[PDB]
Nucleic acid binder design. Structure first.
Lengths: 183, 63, 135
DNA sequence: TTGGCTATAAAAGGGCTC
DNA sequence: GAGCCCTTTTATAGCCAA
């Protein structure tokens, strides 16, 4: 009959892009301004940029991982700036196979929730152990996304490849959540 | 008493030389730390009864 | 870093080990600190035994050898046991995931079950809504 | 308050265990 | 070799810190 009326907001995005050319992290870490490198602890350069505020993990194979964006194109932009950076540093930097790998969303249903029950009616899809973690962990099968539901009515959605999966997951869970409202 | 592996790993890596460490390591070090305190406290207790346990009774065990 | 094992952990150890022994708060601070020293001692020795072992990651073996090497050989008994339970825990956890992904109710019926709960809930809030809307 | 543990998804690879 | 680890990011949030 009605749509929740609540639209989940994007909080994080993980994309990957292949620069297509071997890279020497020692070299990159050497001159790149905000670059970290400890092949000791982690086998990849850790670069960051202020806008879009993000973080990239650059590997030797040229492949890269970009995290922190709040939208698909914001993530693709940041990915490009990281590409031009590796580029200016004297490397044959291309921009191949950019792909969003994960999207995180969050919203507020604006009302407490009886996690205690939800984990009973839907036990085969839930994992609730307040001793371990305060929120209820919900695994939706279609679309395939994971939700973090908190007594306060705040809800996190993750695992999506395209934002529609997040909106589909929330619209499915909203009526369930209203059926477990706390009073 | 068992000790926080996460904390133990963070402590281990306060050393720049220490690289990656196997997940199970911090937990055995915890057991080791446990065996070390029991042996240490029990000796210091002896030193205390040969005089409340103080900072001195302990140091004379890390000499 | 100024990381140290939680005071409470050391106090539970003192209580469990020295039942009925007043321990100065000052001394309690020294034990908390010996803890971090020991971790560094074992780690450093293990890290060397490691470089030599042509390996990259400090393994539970390097830690056992450092213990012996450092003069803590008498711990290797109880430490081997813990290393065991660790392998067992990891093994059980591997097999549990294997079953979760390969021997559970076929996804098809799991999906159906879940959609049933979803459609059903839409139905309820559909009525509970329309009814309240009839006022 | 600050911040780290705990939890989730996901990619990248070099290191490891049955 | 199948598959877990580690590292990074982020919403959310109780427990903990001596």
């Amino acid at each position: 009959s009605h749509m929740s009326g609540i639209v989940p907001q994007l909080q994080n995005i993980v994309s990957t892009v292949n620069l297509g050319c071997k890279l020497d992290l020692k070299t990159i870490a050497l001159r790149a301004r905000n670059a970290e490198y400890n092949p000791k602890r982690f086998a990849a350069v850790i670069m960051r940029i202020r806008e879009p505020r993000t973080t990239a993990l650059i590997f030797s194979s040229g492949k890269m991982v970009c995290t922190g964006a709040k939208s698909e194109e914001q993530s693709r932009l940041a990915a490009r700036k990281y590409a031009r950076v590796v580029q200016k540093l004297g490397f044959p930097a291309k921009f191949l196979d950019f792909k969003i790998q994960n999207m995180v969303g969050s919203c507020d249903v604006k009302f407490p929730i009886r996690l205690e029950g939800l984990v009973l009616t839907h036990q085969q899809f839930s994992s609730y152990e307040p001793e371990l973690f305060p929120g209820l962990i919900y695994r939706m099968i279609k679309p395939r996304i994971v939700l973090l539901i908190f007594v306060s009515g705040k809800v996190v959605l993750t695992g999506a490849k395209v934002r529609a999966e997040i909106y589909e997951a929330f619209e499915n869970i909203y009526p369930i959540l209203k059926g477990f409202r706390k009073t | 008493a068992r000790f926080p592996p996460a904390r133990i790993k963070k402590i281990m890596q306060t050393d720049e030389e220490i690289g990656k460490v196997a997940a199970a390591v911090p937990v055995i070090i915890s057991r080791a730390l446990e065996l070390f305190l029991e042996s240490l406290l029990k000796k210091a207790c002896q030193v205390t009864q040969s005089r409340t346990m103080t900072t001195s009774h302990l140091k004379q065990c890390i000499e | 870093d100024d990381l140290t094992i939680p005071r409470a952990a050391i106090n539970k150890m003192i209580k469990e080990t020295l039942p009925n022994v007043r321990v100065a708060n000052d001394a309690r601070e020294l034990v908390v600190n010996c803890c971090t020293e020991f971790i560094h001692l074992i780690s450093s020795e293990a890290n060397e035994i490691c470089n030599k072992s042509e390996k990259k990651t400090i393994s539970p073996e390097h830690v056992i050898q450092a213990l012996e090497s450092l003069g803590f050989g008498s711990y290797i008994s109880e430490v081997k046991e813990v290393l065991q339970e660790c392998k067992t825990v990891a093994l059980k956890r591997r097999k549990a995931s294997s079953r979760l992904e390969n021997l559970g109710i076929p996804e098809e019926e799991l999906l159906r079950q879940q959609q049933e709960l979803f459609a059903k809930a839409r139905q309820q809030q559909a009525e509970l809504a329309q009814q309240e809307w009839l006022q």
